[PDB]
């Protein structure tokens, strides 16, 4: 049974008016801005921005990939699929 998320999970986070986007749950730094209450700080892979999300915009890597891991035209999002496959936990600094 699903525990709450936590630092290192593997998503596919969607935000208004893109695609589910392949994403990690960060750690937040030491020094590094808190995110708002019951919102956690989304890394997508590929563009390796970072939003701020709550639950309701995140997919379970696992559960989704199949449907939603898929090359897309969108400018960094294959290369996201490439980073969430084969090194999702790597520094991207």
Same mark, same amino acid.
């Given at each position: ?33 808190k995110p708002? +209450? @019951? =919102?956690?700080?989304? $890394?997508?892979? /590929?563009?390796? !921005? ?20 898929? +090359? @897309? =035209?969108?400018?960094? $999002?294959?290369? /996201?699929?490439? !980073? ?10």
């Open positions: 049974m699903p525990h709450a998320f936590k630092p290192g999970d593997l998503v596919f986070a969607k935000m208004k008016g893109y695609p589910h986007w392949p994403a990690r749950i960060d750690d937040i730094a030491d020094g590094a801005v708002p +209450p @019951n =919102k956690y700080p989304i $890394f997508f892979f /590929g563009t390796h !921005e970072t939003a701020f999300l709550g639950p309701k915009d995140l997919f379970p890597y696992d559960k989704s990939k199949d449907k939603y891991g898929k +090359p @897309n =035209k969108r400018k960094g $999002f294959n290369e /996201g699929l490439w !980073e969430i496959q084969n090194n999702p936990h790597a520094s991207y600094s």
